[PDB]
Amino acid sequence: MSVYHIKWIQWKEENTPIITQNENGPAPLLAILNVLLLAWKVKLPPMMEIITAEQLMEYLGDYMLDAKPKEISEIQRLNYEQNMSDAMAILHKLQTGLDVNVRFTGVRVFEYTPECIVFDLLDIPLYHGWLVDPQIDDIVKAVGNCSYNQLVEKIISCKQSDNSELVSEGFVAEQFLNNTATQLTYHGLCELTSTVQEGELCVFFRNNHFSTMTKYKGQLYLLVTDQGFLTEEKVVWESLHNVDGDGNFCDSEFHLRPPS
Amino acid sequence: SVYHIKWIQWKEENTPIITQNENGPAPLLAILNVLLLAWKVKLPPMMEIITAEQLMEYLGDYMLDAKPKEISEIQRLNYEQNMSDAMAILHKLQTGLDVNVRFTGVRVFEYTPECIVFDLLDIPLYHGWLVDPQIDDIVKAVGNCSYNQLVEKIISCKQSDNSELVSEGFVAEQFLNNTATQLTYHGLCELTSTVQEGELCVFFRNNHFSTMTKYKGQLYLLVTDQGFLTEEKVVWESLHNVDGDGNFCDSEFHLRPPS
Amino acid sequence: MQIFVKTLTGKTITLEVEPSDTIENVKAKIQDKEGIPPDQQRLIFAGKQLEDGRTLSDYNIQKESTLHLVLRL
Amino acid sequence: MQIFVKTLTGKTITLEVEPSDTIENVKAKIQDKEGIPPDQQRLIFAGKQLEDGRTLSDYNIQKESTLHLVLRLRGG
Amino acid sequence: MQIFVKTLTGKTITLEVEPSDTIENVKAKIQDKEGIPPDQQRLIFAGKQLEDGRTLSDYNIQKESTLHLVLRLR
Amino acid sequence: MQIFVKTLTGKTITLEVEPSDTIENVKAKIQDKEGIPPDQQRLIFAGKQLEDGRTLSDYNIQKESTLHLVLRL
Amino acid sequence: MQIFVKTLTGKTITLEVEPSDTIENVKAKIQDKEGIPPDQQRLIFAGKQLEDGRTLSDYNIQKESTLHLVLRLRGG
Amino acid sequence: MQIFVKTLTGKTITLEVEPSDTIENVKAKIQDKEGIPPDQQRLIFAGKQLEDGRTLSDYNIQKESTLHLVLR
Amino acid sequence: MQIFVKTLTGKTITLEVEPSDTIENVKAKIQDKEGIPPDQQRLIFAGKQLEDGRTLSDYNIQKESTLHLVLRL
Ligand SMILES: [K+]
Ligand SMILES: [K+]
Ligand SMILES: [K+]
Ligand SMILES: [K+]
């Protein structure tokens, strides 16, 4: 079906593989597995240069079963089995695109949809940085505790209202969605930097894309996974310190890459 | 004026920091706490209180002892003039220092004589009062204006007949109101990435000067209020939000448990 | 209007609801009786998951209907 | 009959449908004109989200009615 | 009884079995068609892992039900 | 608006205030809930002491801001 | 004469002055009511900053005129 | 609006674009300023490839954004 | 109007300015001529440093006046 090239890098002094992306779509599956690979909880044969989506799907599902939790009461086991079935049923969507419904009040705040179950069973934190600026009470009131799916419905309803307060609440909430279209705000960056733990491997949602995220020396980094950098041994991590996408490229030991 | 000294274990060495009571002397304490934590100025270890005259005598002694001996003729003359202008202003460090920020960068101030004191000591000066670039309405209204220019622009715009300028003043006024603690989340980001690891610098926020540093990527403010003088474990406060809800940490940047 | 919420184990609770109540609201009403945060709840009806922003009437949930609650760990 | 679908991209699309058309077939017609996959689409009418199992009659969607097309956030 | 074994990639195969068969015999019959080593086979039903020594009747697997196949790769 | 004050023991006090409130007034509102006299209270925001003669607006105290409370000597 | 001084917070201060008081003296009257140091005070009228050596009449300031008081950012 | 395109060599190209421009129209604007042909350009933003056929609007590309350029 | 700015080195620069020009525009003209960036400039007239937001006419800087430029390095 689809094949992905593998990049071998020096992660914590050990040869470690990461999956690389060409076409748009497979970011959810690759962000989850690149976490498992960087954590050495899923290991590949040392020679493999290229892998298809089927073995990645099987490697993942193989780990979900080996990651079965202990000390679970019968209530937890029943709720676990129902969650495990539904997550496996939608597991194929990982390679085509995963549906997310954020709320703009916290980096860990999503709607608990079945596509969140995959991250729960693997204990992989899922983050976003799409946060409302709390110093602007206009937006805080207009957006409230709405999810994205609710806010677009509120804008449509407000845009045709006769209440002068409601038309302004929708206009402000519309202004917010357009100004923050890359799905990352500076308040999100500040909350992410202080929420993600040092050394934590997690998944990051931003601009309709999933990235593997970690924190080193207090700085957030995103795993470089585009095949344009497949031969660049010195381009492994990209720093996340602005909403402009102007990050610093770093090698596998988080050292700055010299311009060459 | 007398200031209480707080002795802390800073980098495993007995180090003193000067501690503030009344409002006013924060410029002088921010500069000297940078110099004390940097072990560029050392105080006899028996001292418990210190007057302003001694503090500035230690300051003035350091500025003269830190003169660049190998400098061109163009550097000597300009240093000479900057030095003279800085001393005539030095007394203001004990009563309050006037700054004029711009909102486009953490290092961006108007180059007033109050800035020379920091240049002569190689002490960076920071603020976090930055516009959110994602809002083009505010970026246009605030522009490259300093604070002093912006309030005047708000004064003038409210009496204009040009509808665009009236709206520009309204947005600029809203920005100054929303961001009244003089810290924004864009500023907090830029500071966290601009301040280097272990850097000792001065931070301007809410008409106050703090001694700032970064440890493992997190920004901290030296706790200099006399209320925490006898709190051995309250040495640094983390800077990770605009609400003032920081975490108190000991001199090794470890979280102080409730007690 | 009263609907039932049944766990996988089989425990049934009654809620006083309105056809216009969102399922966020009924999740909060489950929190009032059972203590689970809404973001730790999963509600299923007619074999499909209900979305937080929809109402009971959007899914045609009528009186004396039974929702299925699934927990997360 | 002919109905309008308003997007957040700033455009209003015209659709040729019939009252017996399932919501899925409406979304498939949107896929043919705007390339959006059906499961990513959310159609809003009367402040209600048109669910997939229903047809246009169940929401009393008559001719020249305007639906609103909002997308789910799909990471890829 | 008619059972279906589907992998995550999408390949669903129909197999003929009896309720009294054990899971070992279930993965041995899956090996008879696809040719997959049985110890590299993990079988799931209703989100529950199937033990080698239990039977289809112990898990109450009914007619026209789908079992999930996960391959234990190297 | 409402603001919070936090003590070193970990207790968090919620106060209702107005920007025109003097610091002496907010210390009197603290006394109403805890019993500490304003003569024994020291209030800090962002590392700077809040002097009893100034107002909340003088220190730009926004709603939901956290102040630190210590006893003085 | 009686003039008004408006702050950025909206407060309006009434001052009893004359056309011949220096700007430094007007700032002293503001300090007596608001405690604000004169060196921290900046007065704006007709788009001009009032300099301490001049008088109110130098800037054509009339009776019942409104001056704008903006402050310098003073770190303390 | 203007956007920036940074290469692995550190060189930054400033481009004048519109949100309705396609990625091919962005690669051709790079060819008008830089010597690289569109057949050899690969464009990335925030880790995601900007695929030919899409617009800048499809990727929510804001003003003053930095795109990354690398060989195809 | 023509004014001169003089450095401590003694080099004198002639600038064509308007009275309504602010000091910020004057520093921008030295930026275009001598290459010194504005926030690394100090202009002095009559012994006082000139603020960026004020104008030449605010300091009574008229025809053939000499400014003093102190450099930042
Ligand atoms: K709504
Ligand atoms: K020492
Ligand atoms: K020692
Ligand atoms: K069920």
Residue numbers in the entry:
A (entry chain A): 240 to 499
B (entry chain B): 241 to 499
C (entry chain G), F (entry chain E), I (entry chain F): 1 to 73
D (entry chain D), G (entry chain C): 1 to 76
E (entry chain I): 1 to 74
H (entry chain H): 1 to 72
Quoted passage from the original study:
MINDY1 and MINDY2 are members of the MINDY family of deubiquitinases (DUBs) that have exquisite specificity for cleaving K48-polyUb, yet we have a poor understanding of their catalytic mechanism. Here, we analyze the crystal structures of MINDY1 and MINDY2 alone and in complex with monoUb, di-, and penta-K48-polyUb, identifying 5 distinct Ub binding sites in the catalytic domain that explain how these DUBs sense both Ub chain length and linkage type to cleave K48-polyUb chains. The activity of MINDY1/2 is inhibited by the Cys-loop, and we find that substrate interaction relieves autoinhibition to activate these DUBs.
The crystal structures of MINDY2cat and MINDY1cat closely resemble one another (root-mean-square deviation [RMSD] 1.05 Å), and both DUBs bind to K48 chains in a similar way. When bound to MINDY1/2, the K48-linked chain adopts an extended conformation that lacks interchain Ub-Ub interactions. The only significant change is in the Cys loop that undergoes significant remodeling, during which several hydrogen bonds are broken, accompanied by the formation of new bonds. This extensive interaction network and remodeling of the Cys loop is also observed in MINDY2, and when restructured, the Cys loop no longer impedes Ub binding. The best fit was obtained for a mixture of two different binding modes: productive (∼15%), where Ub moieties are bound in the S1 and S1′ sites, and unproductive (∼85%), where they are bound in the S1 and S3′ sites. The higher prevalence of Ub binding in the unproductive mode possibly explains the inefficient cleavage of K48-Ub2 by MINDY1 and MINDY2. To our knowledge, these structures of MINDY1/2 represent the first crystal structures of any DUB in complex with K48-linked Ub chains.
